[model samples]
Target: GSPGENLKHIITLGQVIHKRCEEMKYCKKQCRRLGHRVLGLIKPLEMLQDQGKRSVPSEKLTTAMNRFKAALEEANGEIEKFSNRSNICRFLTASQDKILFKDVNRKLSDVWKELSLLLQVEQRMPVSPISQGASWAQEDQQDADEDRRAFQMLRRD
Candidate 1:
Protein backbone atom coordinates (compact mmCIF):
# COMPACT_ATOMS: atom_id res chain seq x y z
CA GLY A 1 0.00 0.00 0.00
CA SER A 2 1.16 3.56 -0.78
CA PRO A 3 0.13 6.85 0.77
CA GLY A 4 -0.87 9.68 -1.50
CA GLU A 5 1.00 12.94 -1.62
CA ASN A 6 -0.52 15.80 0.40
CA LEU A 7 0.33 18.75 -1.81
CA LYS A 8 -1.47 22.02 -1.78
CA HIS A 9 -1.12 25.06 -3.94
CA ILE A 10 -3.76 27.57 -4.89
CA ILE A 11 -4.42 30.38 -7.29
CA THR A 12 -7.62 31.94 -8.48
CA LEU A 13 -8.46 33.92 -11.59
CA GLY A 14 -11.42 36.13 -12.36
CA GLN A 15 -12.82 36.80 -15.78
CA VAL A 16 -10.70 39.46 -17.47
CA ILE A 17 -13.43 42.08 -17.39
CA HIS A 18 -15.98 40.67 -14.98
CA LYS A 19 -15.12 42.68 -11.88
CA ARG A 20 -14.27 45.81 -13.86
CA CYS A 21 -17.64 47.28 -12.96
CA GLU A 22 -16.96 47.24 -9.22
CA GLU A 23 -13.51 48.59 -9.92
CA MET A 24 -15.03 51.43 -11.88
CA LYS A 25 -16.86 52.53 -8.73
CA TYR A 26 -13.62 52.48 -6.75
CA CYS A 27 -11.76 54.27 -9.57
CA LYS A 28 -14.43 56.94 -9.76
CA LYS A 29 -14.06 57.61 -6.04
CA GLN A 30 -10.28 57.93 -6.47
CA CYS A 31 -10.61 60.18 -9.50
CA ARG A 32 -13.18 62.33 -7.74
CA ARG A 33 -10.75 62.85 -4.88
CA LEU A 34 -7.53 63.10 -6.92
CA GLY A 35 -8.75 65.14 -9.93
CA HIS A 36 -10.57 64.55 -13.18
CA ARG A 37 -7.49 64.74 -15.41
CA VAL A 38 -5.99 61.62 -13.90
CA LEU A 39 -8.45 59.31 -15.65
CA GLY A 40 -5.83 56.78 -16.67
CA LEU A 41 -5.47 55.83 -13.02
CA ILE A 42 -8.82 54.10 -13.27
CA LYS A 43 -7.64 50.95 -15.01
CA PRO A 44 -5.12 49.83 -12.43
CA LEU A 45 -7.24 50.97 -9.50
CA GLU A 46 -10.01 48.88 -10.95
CA MET A 47 -7.61 45.97 -11.27
CA LEU A 48 -6.54 46.41 -7.68
CA GLN A 49 -10.12 46.59 -6.41
CA ASP A 50 -11.07 43.59 -8.51
CA GLN A 51 -8.19 41.67 -7.07
CA GLY A 52 -9.44 42.58 -3.63
CA LYS A 53 -13.01 41.46 -4.24
CA ARG A 54 -12.22 37.96 -5.29
CA SER A 55 -14.46 35.10 -4.06
CA VAL A 56 -12.67 34.84 -0.77
CA PRO A 57 -13.72 34.84 2.85
CA SER A 58 -15.22 38.05 4.14
CA GLU A 59 -12.99 37.76 7.19
CA LYS A 60 -10.01 38.12 4.87
CA LEU A 61 -10.61 41.80 4.25
CA THR A 62 -7.48 42.69 6.18
CA THR A 63 -5.50 40.17 4.20
CA ALA A 64 -6.98 41.59 1.03
CA MET A 65 -5.96 45.07 2.12
CA ASN A 66 -2.43 43.83 2.75
CA ARG A 67 -2.25 42.15 -0.66
CA PHE A 68 -3.55 45.23 -2.44
CA LYS A 69 -1.00 47.25 -0.51
CA ALA A 70 1.69 44.93 -1.82
CA ALA A 71 0.49 45.44 -5.38
CA LEU A 72 0.85 49.19 -4.87
CA GLU A 73 4.43 48.58 -3.72
CA GLU A 74 5.12 46.42 -6.77
CA ALA A 75 3.78 49.08 -9.08
CA ASN A 76 5.93 51.66 -7.32
CA GLY A 77 8.97 49.45 -7.89
CA GLU A 78 8.25 49.57 -11.60
CA ILE A 79 9.45 53.16 -11.60
CA GLU A 80 12.94 51.91 -10.80
CA LYS A 81 12.41 49.07 -13.23
CA PHE A 82 11.66 51.59 -15.94
CA SER A 83 14.62 53.72 -14.92
CA ASN A 84 17.07 50.82 -14.97
CA ARG A 85 15.76 49.54 -18.27
CA SER A 86 16.16 53.08 -19.67
CA ASN A 87 14.02 52.17 -22.63
CA ILE A 88 10.39 53.12 -22.97
CA CYS A 89 9.81 50.02 -25.09
CA ARG A 90 11.06 47.62 -22.42
CA PHE A 91 9.14 49.46 -19.72
CA LEU A 92 6.10 49.26 -21.93
CA THR A 93 6.58 45.50 -22.15
CA ALA A 94 6.58 45.09 -18.36
CA SER A 95 3.64 47.42 -17.99
CA GLN A 96 1.64 46.04 -20.91
CA ASP A 97 0.78 43.07 -18.72
CA LYS A 98 -1.09 45.73 -16.72
CA ILE A 99 -1.16 48.63 -19.21
CA LEU A 100 1.13 51.50 -20.28
CA PHE A 101 3.89 52.32 -17.78
CA LYS A 102 2.85 55.96 -17.54
CA ASP A 103 -0.67 55.12 -16.49
CA VAL A 104 0.48 52.41 -14.11
CA ASN A 105 2.93 54.78 -12.52
CA ARG A 106 0.36 57.54 -12.14
CA LYS A 107 -2.28 55.23 -10.70
CA LEU A 108 0.12 53.66 -8.25
CA SER A 109 1.28 57.06 -7.10
CA ASP A 110 -2.28 58.27 -6.64
CA VAL A 111 -3.15 55.11 -4.75
CA TRP A 112 -0.25 55.47 -2.34
CA LYS A 113 -1.10 59.09 -1.77
CA GLU A 114 -4.73 58.24 -1.15
CA LEU A 115 -3.78 55.41 1.18
CA SER A 116 -1.55 57.75 3.14
CA LEU A 117 -4.26 60.32 3.55
CA LEU A 118 -6.84 57.78 4.62
CA LEU A 119 -4.41 56.13 6.99
CA GLN A 120 -3.52 59.46 8.49
CA VAL A 121 -7.16 60.17 9.06
CA GLU A 122 -7.57 56.76 10.62
CA GLN A 123 -4.60 57.15 12.89
CA ARG A 124 -5.75 60.46 14.24
CA MET A 125 -9.05 58.96 15.33
CA PRO A 126 -9.43 56.92 18.47
CA VAL A 127 -9.90 53.23 17.94
CA SER A 128 -13.05 51.39 19.06
CA PRO A 129 -12.47 47.91 20.33
CA ILE A 130 -16.03 46.81 19.72
CA SER A 131 -16.26 47.76 16.06
CA GLN A 132 -12.69 47.62 14.88
CA GLY A 133 -12.55 48.65 11.19
CA ALA A 134 -16.32 48.76 11.00
CA SER A 135 -16.12 52.04 12.85
CA TRP A 136 -14.51 53.63 9.83
CA ALA A 137 -17.32 52.40 7.63
CA GLN A 138 -19.77 53.98 10.03
CA GLU A 139 -17.75 57.18 10.07
CA ASP A 140 -17.93 57.31 6.31
CA GLN A 141 -21.68 57.02 6.42
CA GLN A 142 -21.80 59.88 8.90
CA ASP A 143 -19.67 62.00 6.58
CA ALA A 144 -22.03 61.28 3.71
CA ASP A 145 -24.89 62.49 5.82
CA GLU A 146 -22.97 65.62 6.66
CA ASP A 147 -22.28 66.21 2.99
CA ARG A 148 -25.97 65.92 2.19
CA ARG A 149 -26.81 68.42 4.90
CA ALA A 150 -24.19 70.81 3.60
CA PHE A 151 -25.55 70.52 0.09
CA GLN A 152 -28.96 71.46 1.38
CA MET A 153 -27.47 74.33 3.34
CA LEU A 154 -25.68 75.53 0.20
CA ARG A 155 -28.94 75.63 -1.76
CA ARG A 156 -30.37 78.05 0.84
CA ASP A 157 -27.27 80.20 0.66
Candidate 2:
Protein backbone atom coordinates (compact mmCIF):
# COMPACT_ATOMS: atom_id res chain seq x y z
CA GLY A 1 0.00 0.00 0.00
CA SER A 2 1.01 3.62 -0.46
CA PRO A 3 2.55 5.59 2.40
CA GLY A 4 -0.52 7.75 2.76
CA GLU A 5 -2.73 4.69 2.92
CA ASN A 6 -0.45 3.14 5.49
CA LEU A 7 -0.62 6.30 7.57
CA LYS A 8 -4.41 6.29 7.34
CA HIS A 9 -4.51 2.73 8.58
CA ILE A 10 -2.19 3.62 11.44
CA ILE A 11 -4.41 6.52 12.46
CA THR A 12 -7.50 4.31 12.34
CA LEU A 13 -5.85 1.68 14.44
CA GLY A 14 -4.68 4.28 16.91
CA GLN A 15 -8.21 5.58 17.21
CA VAL A 16 -9.54 2.10 17.77
CA ILE A 17 -7.04 1.44 20.50
CA HIS A 18 -7.92 4.70 22.16
CA LYS A 19 -11.64 3.91 22.04
CA ARG A 20 -11.10 0.48 23.45
CA CYS A 21 -8.92 1.83 26.22
CA GLU A 22 -11.60 4.29 27.18
CA GLU A 23 -14.33 1.67 27.09
CA MET A 24 -12.31 -0.66 29.23
CA LYS A 25 -11.53 2.14 31.66
CA TYR A 26 -8.01 0.82 31.42
CA CYS A 27 -6.48 2.91 34.20
CA LYS A 28 -9.43 4.02 36.26
CA LYS A 29 -9.08 7.61 37.55
CA GLN A 30 -5.48 7.93 36.36
CA CYS A 31 -6.32 6.66 32.93
CA ARG A 32 -9.31 8.89 32.52
CA ARG A 33 -7.28 11.91 33.58
CA LEU A 34 -4.44 11.26 31.14
CA GLY A 35 -6.19 9.22 28.48
CA HIS A 36 -5.91 12.14 26.10
CA ARG A 37 -2.28 11.28 25.58
CA VAL A 38 -3.35 8.37 23.41
CA LEU A 39 -4.75 10.88 20.98
CA GLY A 40 -1.28 12.37 20.53
CA LEU A 41 -0.81 9.85 17.72
CA ILE A 42 -3.11 11.94 15.56
CA LYS A 43 -0.69 14.88 15.36
CA PRO A 44 2.22 12.87 13.99
CA LEU A 45 -0.09 10.86 11.77
CA GLU A 46 -1.54 14.03 10.27
CA MET A 47 1.95 15.43 9.67
CA LEU A 48 2.74 12.65 7.24
CA GLN A 49 -0.69 11.41 6.18
CA ASP A 50 -0.53 13.17 2.80
CA GLN A 51 3.18 12.94 2.14
CA GLY A 52 2.87 10.02 -0.27
CA LYS A 53 0.39 11.91 -2.40
CA ARG A 54 2.72 14.89 -2.61
CA SER A 55 6.14 13.27 -2.93
CA VAL A 56 8.18 10.08 -2.87
CA PRO A 57 8.27 8.17 0.39
CA SER A 58 11.41 8.31 2.47
CA GLU A 59 12.92 4.83 3.05
CA LYS A 60 13.58 5.57 6.73
CA LEU A 61 10.13 6.98 7.31
CA THR A 62 8.57 3.98 5.59
CA THR A 63 10.53 1.59 7.79
CA ALA A 64 9.50 3.46 10.92
CA MET A 65 5.87 3.46 9.80
CA ASN A 66 5.99 -0.29 9.24
CA ARG A 67 7.39 -0.83 12.72
CA PHE A 68 4.68 1.34 14.26
CA LYS A 69 2.03 -0.56 12.29
CA ALA A 70 3.30 -3.85 13.62
CA ALA A 71 3.29 -2.54 17.19
CA LEU A 72 -0.23 -1.19 16.82
CA GLU A 73 -1.42 -4.52 15.43
CA GLU A 74 -0.02 -6.31 18.44
CA ALA A 75 -1.70 -3.90 20.83
CA ASN A 76 -5.00 -4.25 18.96
CA GLY A 77 -4.82 -8.01 19.29
CA GLU A 78 -4.32 -7.72 23.04
CA ILE A 79 -7.34 -5.45 23.31
CA GLU A 80 -9.41 -7.93 21.34
CA LYS A 81 -8.42 -10.72 23.65
CA PHE A 82 -9.51 -8.72 26.67
CA SER A 83 -12.76 -7.66 25.04
CA ASN A 84 -13.65 -11.18 23.89
CA ARG A 85 -13.64 -12.64 27.35
CA SER A 86 -17.02 -13.47 28.93
CA ASN A 87 -18.50 -12.64 32.34
CA ILE A 88 -15.93 -9.98 32.98
CA CYS A 89 -17.63 -8.68 36.12
CA ARG A 90 -18.14 -12.16 37.46
CA PHE A 91 -14.54 -13.19 36.84
CA LEU A 92 -12.68 -9.94 37.29
CA THR A 93 -12.25 -7.80 40.39
CA ALA A 94 -10.63 -4.40 40.82
CA SER A 95 -7.22 -5.97 41.39
CA GLN A 96 -7.70 -8.33 38.49
CA ASP A 97 -8.86 -5.47 36.38
CA LYS A 98 -5.81 -3.49 37.34
CA ILE A 99 -3.55 -6.28 36.18
CA LEU A 100 -5.35 -6.54 32.86
CA PHE A 101 -5.24 -2.80 32.46
CA LYS A 102 -1.52 -2.77 33.09
CA ASP A 103 -1.00 -5.31 30.36
CA VAL A 104 -2.88 -3.24 27.85
CA ASN A 105 -1.22 -0.08 29.05
CA ARG A 106 2.19 -1.56 28.41
CA LYS A 107 1.17 -2.52 24.90
CA LEU A 108 -0.14 0.96 24.21
CA SER A 109 3.06 2.43 25.61
CA ASP A 110 4.97 0.40 23.06
CA VAL A 111 2.78 1.85 20.35
CA TRP A 112 3.63 5.33 21.60
CA LYS A 113 7.33 4.54 21.48
CA GLU A 114 7.03 3.29 17.93
CA LEU A 115 5.20 6.44 16.97
CA SER A 116 7.95 8.54 18.56
CA LEU A 117 10.48 6.68 16.45
CA LEU A 118 8.42 7.33 13.36
CA LEU A 119 8.28 11.03 14.16
CA GLN A 120 12.02 11.12 14.76
CA VAL A 121 12.65 9.49 11.40
CA GLU A 122 10.44 12.00 9.66
CA GLN A 123 12.20 14.87 11.45
CA ARG A 124 15.55 13.66 10.18
CA MET A 125 14.44 13.89 6.58
CA PRO A 126 15.14 17.11 4.67
CA VAL A 127 11.91 18.94 4.05
CA SER A 128 10.76 22.47 3.34
CA PRO A 129 9.45 24.16 6.48
CA ILE A 130 8.22 26.83 4.04
CA SER A 131 5.34 24.51 3.31
CA GLN A 132 3.68 25.95 6.41
CA GLY A 133 5.64 29.23 6.12
CA ALA A 134 5.00 32.51 7.94
CA SER A 135 1.35 31.86 8.49
CA TRP A 136 2.11 28.86 10.63
CA ALA A 137 4.54 30.88 12.73
CA GLN A 138 2.01 33.64 13.12
CA GLU A 139 -0.63 31.17 14.20
CA ASP A 140 1.72 29.68 16.79
CA GLN A 141 2.51 33.11 18.16
CA GLN A 142 -1.19 33.95 18.33
CA ASP A 143 -1.84 30.75 20.22
CA ALA A 144 0.90 31.56 22.72
CA ASP A 145 -0.49 35.03 23.23
CA GLU A 146 -3.96 33.66 23.81
CA ASP A 147 -2.57 31.16 26.32
CA ARG A 148 -0.81 33.90 28.24
CA ARG A 149 -3.93 36.00 28.37
CA ALA A 150 -5.98 33.06 29.61
CA PHE A 151 -3.42 32.34 32.30
CA GLN A 152 -3.40 35.93 33.45
CA MET A 153 -7.18 36.03 33.55
CA LEU A 154 -7.29 32.85 35.63
CA ARG A 155 -4.71 34.26 38.08
CA ARG A 156 -6.63 37.52 38.51
CA ASP A 157 -9.92 35.81 39.21
Candidate 3:
Protein backbone atom coordinates (compact mmCIF):
# COMPACT_ATOMS: atom_id res chain seq x y z
CA GLY A 1 0.00 0.00 0.00
CA SER A 2 0.95 3.60 -0.52
CA PRO A 3 1.07 6.42 2.01
CA GLY A 4 -2.66 7.04 1.83
CA GLU A 5 -3.48 3.40 2.47
CA ASN A 6 -1.17 3.38 5.44
CA LEU A 7 -2.74 6.57 6.70
CA LYS A 8 -6.19 5.05 6.33
CA HIS A 9 -5.20 2.04 8.41
CA ILE A 10 -3.72 4.27 11.08
CA ILE A 11 -6.83 6.43 11.18
CA THR A 12 -9.47 3.68 10.93
CA LEU A 13 -7.81 1.34 13.39
CA GLY A 14 -7.45 4.26 15.79
CA GLN A 15 -11.16 4.98 15.44
CA VAL A 16 -11.88 1.32 15.96
CA ILE A 17 -10.02 1.37 19.24
CA HIS A 18 -11.64 4.66 20.20
CA LYS A 19 -15.14 3.22 19.81
CA ARG A 20 -14.30 -0.35 20.78
CA CYS A 21 -12.72 0.70 24.06
CA GLU A 22 -16.17 1.24 25.54
CA GLU A 23 -17.17 -2.40 24.98
CA MET A 24 -14.44 -3.82 27.16
CA LYS A 25 -15.57 -4.97 30.59
CA TYR A 26 -12.16 -4.63 32.20
CA CYS A 27 -9.69 -1.79 31.85
CA LYS A 28 -12.19 -0.25 29.51
CA LYS A 29 -11.52 3.16 30.90
CA GLN A 30 -7.81 2.94 30.30
CA CYS A 31 -8.44 1.46 26.90
CA ARG A 32 -10.47 4.46 25.92
CA ARG A 33 -8.00 6.68 27.66
CA LEU A 34 -5.28 5.47 25.38
CA GLY A 35 -7.75 5.46 22.53
CA HIS A 36 -8.48 9.12 22.99
CA ARG A 37 -4.79 9.86 22.99
CA VAL A 38 -4.62 8.03 19.71
CA LEU A 39 -7.62 9.99 18.52
CA GLY A 40 -5.86 13.21 19.50
CA LEU A 41 -3.16 12.53 16.97
CA ILE A 42 -5.58 11.78 14.14
CA LYS A 43 -6.54 15.34 13.32
CA PRO A 44 -2.92 16.34 12.98
CA LEU A 45 -2.24 13.18 11.05
CA GLU A 46 -5.04 13.94 8.61
CA MET A 47 -3.65 17.37 8.03
CA LEU A 48 -0.20 15.98 7.42
CA GLN A 49 -1.65 13.27 5.19
CA ASP A 50 -3.42 15.90 3.15
CA GLN A 51 -0.22 17.88 2.85
CA GLY A 52 1.61 14.76 1.75
CA LYS A 53 -0.84 14.13 -1.06
CA ARG A 54 -0.65 17.68 -2.27
CA SER A 55 3.12 17.60 -2.42
CA VAL A 56 5.17 14.40 -2.37
CA PRO A 57 7.29 12.12 -0.24
CA SER A 58 10.68 12.71 1.28
CA GLU A 59 12.85 10.18 3.07
CA LYS A 60 11.99 11.75 6.39
CA LEU A 61 8.25 11.66 5.74
CA THR A 62 8.30 8.11 4.38
CA THR A 63 10.23 6.98 7.44
CA ALA A 64 7.90 8.77 9.78
CA MET A 65 4.79 7.43 8.07
CA ASN A 66 6.03 3.87 8.21
CA ARG A 67 6.87 4.12 11.88
CA PHE A 68 3.55 5.79 12.69
CA LYS A 69 1.66 3.11 10.79
CA ALA A 70 3.47 0.31 12.56
CA ALA A 71 3.08 1.83 16.00
CA LEU A 72 -0.63 2.55 15.52
CA GLU A 73 -1.12 -0.89 14.01
CA GLU A 74 0.23 -2.64 17.09
CA ALA A 75 -1.69 -0.38 19.46
CA ASN A 76 -4.94 -0.94 17.58
CA GLY A 77 -4.65 -4.70 17.86
CA GLU A 78 -3.78 -4.49 21.54
CA ILE A 79 -7.03 -2.72 22.28
CA GLU A 80 -9.09 -4.62 19.71
CA LYS A 81 -8.11 -8.17 20.69
CA PHE A 82 -8.22 -7.46 24.40
CA SER A 83 -11.74 -6.13 24.23
CA ASN A 84 -12.87 -9.14 22.23
CA ARG A 85 -11.35 -11.73 24.53
CA SER A 86 -13.19 -14.00 26.98
CA ASN A 87 -14.04 -12.57 30.38
CA ILE A 88 -11.51 -14.79 32.08
CA CYS A 89 -8.90 -13.87 29.53
CA ARG A 90 -9.78 -10.23 29.96
CA PHE A 91 -9.36 -10.45 33.70
CA LEU A 92 -6.11 -12.35 33.36
CA THR A 93 -4.66 -9.97 30.84
CA ALA A 94 -5.99 -6.75 32.24
CA SER A 95 -3.13 -6.22 34.64
CA GLN A 96 -0.54 -7.20 32.12
CA ASP A 97 -2.21 -4.92 29.63
CA LYS A 98 -1.86 -1.93 31.89
CA ILE A 99 1.90 -2.34 32.10
CA LEU A 100 2.07 -2.99 28.40
CA PHE A 101 -0.11 0.06 28.03
CA LYS A 102 2.74 2.38 28.97
CA ASP A 103 5.06 0.63 26.58
CA VAL A 104 2.52 1.17 23.84
CA ASN A 105 2.33 4.83 24.64
CA ARG A 106 6.09 5.13 24.61
CA LYS A 107 6.18 3.99 21.03
CA LEU A 108 3.28 6.24 20.18
CA SER A 109 5.24 9.16 21.58
CA ASP A 110 8.23 8.08 19.56
CA VAL A 111 6.23 8.00 16.37
CA TRP A 112 4.28 10.98 17.57
CA LYS A 113 7.48 13.00 17.43
CA GLU A 114 8.41 11.56 14.07
CA LEU A 115 5.02 12.18 12.55
CA SER A 116 4.58 15.56 14.18
CA LEU A 117 7.89 16.67 12.73
CA LEU A 118 6.44 16.16 9.27
CA LEU A 119 4.33 19.19 10.02
CA GLN A 120 5.52 22.45 11.47
CA VAL A 121 3.54 21.95 14.65
CA GLU A 122 6.16 20.76 17.12
CA GLN A 123 5.03 19.38 20.53
CA ARG A 124 6.15 18.29 23.93
CA MET A 125 4.98 17.30 27.41
CA PRO A 126 5.91 19.05 30.64
CA VAL A 127 7.95 16.25 32.11
CA SER A 128 10.30 13.53 30.82
CA PRO A 129 8.10 10.53 31.63
CA ILE A 130 8.31 9.61 27.98
CA SER A 131 11.56 7.79 28.68
CA GLN A 132 9.98 5.27 31.05
CA GLY A 133 6.76 5.17 29.04
CA ALA A 134 4.41 7.76 30.48
CA SER A 135 0.66 7.97 31.04
CA TRP A 136 -0.13 9.28 27.61
CA ALA A 137 -3.72 10.45 27.86
CA GLN A 138 -2.97 12.64 30.84
CA GLU A 139 0.28 13.96 29.47
CA ASP A 140 -1.33 14.55 26.09
CA GLN A 141 -4.14 16.48 27.69
CA GLN A 142 -1.57 18.55 29.50
CA ASP A 143 0.13 19.22 26.21
CA ALA A 144 -3.12 20.43 24.68
CA ASP A 145 -3.90 22.65 27.61
CA GLU A 146 -0.35 23.92 27.51
CA ASP A 147 -0.81 24.75 23.86
CA ARG A 148 -3.98 26.66 24.55
CA ARG A 149 -2.33 28.58 27.32
CA ALA A 150 0.69 29.29 25.20
CA PHE A 151 -1.51 30.53 22.40
CA GLN A 152 -3.34 32.82 24.75
CA MET A 153 -0.09 34.05 26.23
CA LEU A 154 1.29 34.65 22.77
CA ARG A 155 -1.78 36.65 21.89
CA ARG A 156 -1.39 38.70 25.06
CA ASP A 157 2.21 39.35 24.13
Per-prediction tally of clashes? 0, 0, 0
What is the alpha-carbon lDDT of model 1 when measured against the actual structure? 0.32
lDDT (tens digit, per residue) of candidate 3 on 13-90: 656766766676444545656676667777555555544453344556556766766776777677656554364244
Local accuracy by lDDT, each model: 0.32, 0.48, 0.56
Clashing pairs for model 3 are none
Model 1 ranges off by over 4 Å: 1-59, 89-98, 102-157
Q: For residues 1-157, what per-residue lDDT tens digits would candidate 2 score against the true structure?
A: 4335656877787666556566653222223322344445554566666664854445654665566666546655565555533533333433233233344445445545554555666665332222222433343344434433443343455
Which structure among the candidates has the greatest lDDT?
Answer: 3
Q: Which 10-residue window of candidate 1 scores lowest in summed lDDT?
A: 4-13
Tens-digit lDDT track of model 1 for 1-157? 1221110000111122222323433222222322222222233334334343334333233333343344334432433333332343353335433222334334434444444344335334221122323333343344434433443443465
List runs of model 2 lying over 4 Å from the truth.
1-3, 21-35, 51-56, 84-97, 111-115, 124-157
Model 3 regions lying over 4 Å from their true place: 1-3, 48-55, 84-100, 121-157
Model 1 lDDT, residue 139, Cα: 39
- In angstroms, give how far residue 124 of model 1 lies from its true place: 16
- Pairs that collide in candidate 1 are none
